[PDB]
Every structure is written in C-alpha cells, then in structure tokens.
Design an enzyme around this catalytic site. Structure first.
Site, PDB file in Angstrom:
ATOM      1  N   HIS A  40       0.784  -1.243   0.066  1.00 50.88           N
ATOM      2  CA  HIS A  40       0.242   0.052  -0.205  1.00 50.88           C
ATOM      3  C   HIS A  40       0.956   1.269  -0.159  1.00 50.88           C
ATOM      4  O   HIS A  40       0.451   2.335  -0.200  1.00 50.88           O
ATOM      5  CB  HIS A  40      -0.918   0.008   0.935  1.00 50.88           C
ATOM      6  CG  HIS A  40      -0.615   0.534   2.430  1.00 50.88           C
ATOM      7  ND1 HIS A  40      -0.417  -0.258   3.413  1.00 50.88           N
ATOM      8  CD2 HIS A  40      -0.597   1.790   2.952  1.00 50.88           C
ATOM      9  CE1 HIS A  40      -0.166   0.157   4.524  1.00 50.88           C
ATOM     10  NE2 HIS A  40      -0.179   1.598   4.222  1.00 50.88           N
ATOM     11  N   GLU A  52      19.133   6.619   9.235  1.00 51.39           N
ATOM     12  CA  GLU A  52      18.109   7.997   9.840  1.00 51.39           C
ATOM     13  C   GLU A  52      17.922   7.830  11.254  1.00 51.39           C
ATOM     14  O   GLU A  52      17.608   7.072  11.921  1.00 51.39           O
ATOM     15  CB  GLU A  52      17.065   7.925   8.887  1.00 51.39           C
ATOM     16  CG  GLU A  52      17.068   8.378   7.410  1.00 51.39           C
ATOM     17  CD  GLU A  52      17.447   9.916   7.478  1.00 51.39           C
ATOM     18  OE1 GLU A  52      17.702  10.623   8.337  1.00 51.39           O
ATOM     19  OE2 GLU A  52      17.150  10.393   6.354  1.00 51.39           O
ATOM     20  N   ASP A  84      -0.176  -7.509   1.786  1.00 56.60           N
ATOM     21  CA  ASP A  84       0.408  -6.313   1.747  1.00 56.60           C
ATOM     22  C   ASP A  84       2.071  -6.132   2.270  1.00 56.60           C
ATOM     23  O   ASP A  84       2.401  -5.913   3.009  1.00 56.60           O
ATOM     24  CB  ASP A  84      -0.443  -5.253   2.867  1.00 56.60           C
ATOM     25  CG  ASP A  84      -0.003  -3.864   2.573  1.00 56.60           C
ATOM     26  OD1 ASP A  84       0.382  -3.460   1.774  1.00 56.60           O
ATOM     27  OD2 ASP A  84      -0.357  -3.081   3.711  1.00 56.60           O
ATOM     28  N   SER A 172       0.903   1.407  16.501  1.00 59.49           N
ATOM     29  CA  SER A 172       1.556   1.903  15.346  1.00 59.49           C
ATOM     30  C   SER A 172       0.498   2.831  14.832  1.00 59.49           C
ATOM     31  O   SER A 172      -0.551   2.792  15.210  1.00 59.49           O
ATOM     32  CB  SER A 172       2.148   1.010  14.307  1.00 59.49           C
ATOM     33  OG  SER A 172       1.131   0.203  13.957  1.00 59.49           O
ATOM     34  N   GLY A 175       2.110   6.629   8.831  1.00 61.66           N
ATOM     35  CA  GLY A 175       3.370   7.089   8.716  1.00 61.66           C
ATOM     36  C   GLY A 175       4.229   6.077   9.160  1.00 61.66           C
ATOM     37  O   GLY A 175       5.580   6.133   9.033  1.00 61.66           O
ATOM     38  N   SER A 177       3.496   2.995   8.212  1.00 61.58           N
ATOM     39  CA  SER A 177       3.251   2.090   7.325  1.00 61.58           C
ATOM     40  C   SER A 177       4.587   1.433   6.644  1.00 61.58           C
ATOM     41  O   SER A 177       5.283   2.381   6.260  1.00 61.58           O
ATOM     42  CB  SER A 177       2.061   2.456   6.314  1.00 61.58           C
ATOM     43  OG  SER A 177       1.194   2.673   6.815  1.00 61.58           O
ATOM     44  N   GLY A 178       4.459   0.109   6.473  1.00 57.14           N
ATOM     45  CA  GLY A 178       5.977  -0.659   5.825  1.00 57.14           C
ATOM     46  C   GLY A 178       7.139  -1.012   6.883  1.00 57.14           C
ATOM     47  O   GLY A 178       7.938  -1.630   6.241  1.00 57.14           O
TER      48      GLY A 178
END
Ligand SMILES: Cc1c(F)c(Oc2cccc(C(=N)N)c2)[nH+]c(Oc2cccc(C(=N)N)c2)c1F
Ligand SMILES: [Ca+2]
Ligand SMILES: [K+]
Length: 223
Positions: A40, A52, A84, A172, A175, A177-178
């Site tokens: 997604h 980061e 997903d 969660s 922002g 996601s993944g």
C-alpha cells in the site's frame, strides 16, 4: 507510534524511511540490495533513506539511495489489504556498518504472546496529529488470532496478525506503514493497517512475513 519511546539514534539499524520528497512510509533492509515494505506504500520514484534518526536533519550517518525496481506481491488486494508486502531493489548496494544493518527473515512463524519491537516516524497521537522527527519505538505482543478476528470480523486473512494492546493507548499509526515488526531478532511483521490508532479493542494489523519467505527468496534471487 502512539504511546512509545524515543529509540535513540541508530538503535534500529535495519529501519528505512521511504521518501518521495517527504517521508511517506517505513521499510526494512533485508540485505545490501533489498528492502521489504507494504504494497500500500507503492509509489513511482522512491528514494530509500538508511541510517536515519532525525528525518529533517542531516546528522552524518545517512545513505540516500534511489530504487531501481519495485515488486508488489502478485496477489496484493488493495481493498482488503490481503498480502500487503512489496520488495524494493536499491540502485546500488548499501554500505553495512554499525548504523545500517539488515534484519533476517524468520525460519518459522511467531506465537501469540511473543514480544516484538515496532518502530517508525508515524503519528504519535491517538486522536489529533503530531509527527515526530525522530524514530519512535514500541514493545508490543502478538495477540491471539481469536482476539484479532473478534476485533475485525470478516477482515482478517491468514496473512495477517494483530499485535498491540486491547486496552488501547499504544499502537503503530499512519506514517509507520511498511515499518518492521521484529520478534526474537527476525522480521515477523510489516505495519499494514488499523482502525484509528491506539483505540480500545482495535489493535494494529500486520502482514505475517513468515508466510512470504519462499516468495521473498525466490524473487530477490531472480531480480
Ligand atoms: C485512513 C486509514 C486507513 F484506511 C487504515 O487502514 C486501512 C486502509 C485500507 C484498507 C483497510 C481495510 N481493512 N480493508 C484498512 N489505517 C489507517 O491508519 C493506520 C495505518 C497503519 C497502522 C495503524 C494502526 N492503528 N496500527 C493505523 C488510516 F489512517
Ligand atoms: Ca537525518
Ligand atoms: K499509512
């Protein structure tokens, strides 16, 4: 991440930020050339940001690399969010160091009650909006499958698992996601969807990676 803590700079080395002029999703580095994320989160023109901490400050340990290829699982259903998961091939190999590391793939699926670490730069508010610049972390257990399906009737497939707190307040969020879900040092989940964030009896839903290992291994080997 709602109700979490500040991870500390590069304490989650395998965590990646997906950027398209701004941070839009999280991801996981599984080897020097590949990142796993949510389907997604698919977009044309992604830049992978490794090492980061503060996404808005260049602190010195970042590696910014463009994506050469994106592969969404052949059966990804955008309406149900079934399968997903997506693979992202880096333009050039990342340099592995103490701040940039890969996370291994599981050899088996995790049990309910297993404690995991979820991380991301997503919203930190239950109901309102506040985005952090630094990586947030959260410890959360995998919930039994019955609690998951009771919370979301007719929407949980065998490719999904719930982790969080039924009592709400820790989850969660968008922002995230993944983003990775690591249990016992293996990538067990990807941040997929939810109903609001940190709401009572509406836990986070995750892609169950353990079901995709042969698909990941075969796809990378051939691309
Ligand atoms: C607008 C929106 C969603 F649609 C969504 O979930 C979806 C999106 C598309 C399809 C389905 C579906 N059930 N068929 C569910 N999650 C959100 O927040 C998030 C995002 C990520 C995690 C969480 C979370 N609470 N853990 C919430 C969100 F803000
Ligand atoms: Ca930075
Ligand atoms: K999202």
């Amino acid at each position: 991440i709602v109700g979490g803590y500040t991870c500390g700079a590069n304490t989650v080395p395998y965590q990646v930020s997906l950027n398209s002029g701004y941070h839009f999703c999280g991801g996981s580095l599984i080897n020097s050339q590949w990142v796993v994320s949510a389907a997604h989160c698919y977009k044309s023109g992604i830049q992978v940001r490794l090492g980061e901490d503060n996404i808005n400050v260049v602190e010195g340990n970042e590696q910014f690399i463009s994506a050469s290829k994106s592969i969404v699982h052949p059966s990804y259903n955008s309406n149900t969010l079934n399968n997903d998961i997506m693979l992202i091939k880096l333009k050039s190999a990342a340099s592995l160091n103490s701040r940039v590391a890969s996370i291994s793939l599981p050899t088996s699926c995790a049990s309910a009650g297993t404690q995991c670490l979820i991380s991301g730069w997503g919203n930190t508010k239950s109901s309102g909006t506040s985005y952090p610049d630094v990586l947030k972390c959260l410890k959360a257990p995998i919930l039994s499958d019955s609690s998951c399906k009771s919370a979301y009737p007719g929407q949980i497939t065998s490719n999904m698992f719930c982790a969080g707190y039924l009592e709400g307040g820790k989850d969660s969020c968008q922002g995230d996601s993944g983003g990775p879900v690591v249990c016992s040092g293996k990538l067990q989940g990807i941040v997929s969807w939810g109903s609001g964030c940190a709401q009572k009896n509406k836990p986070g839903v995750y892609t169950k990676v353990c079901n995709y290992v042969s698909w990941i291994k075969q796809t990378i080997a051939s691309n």
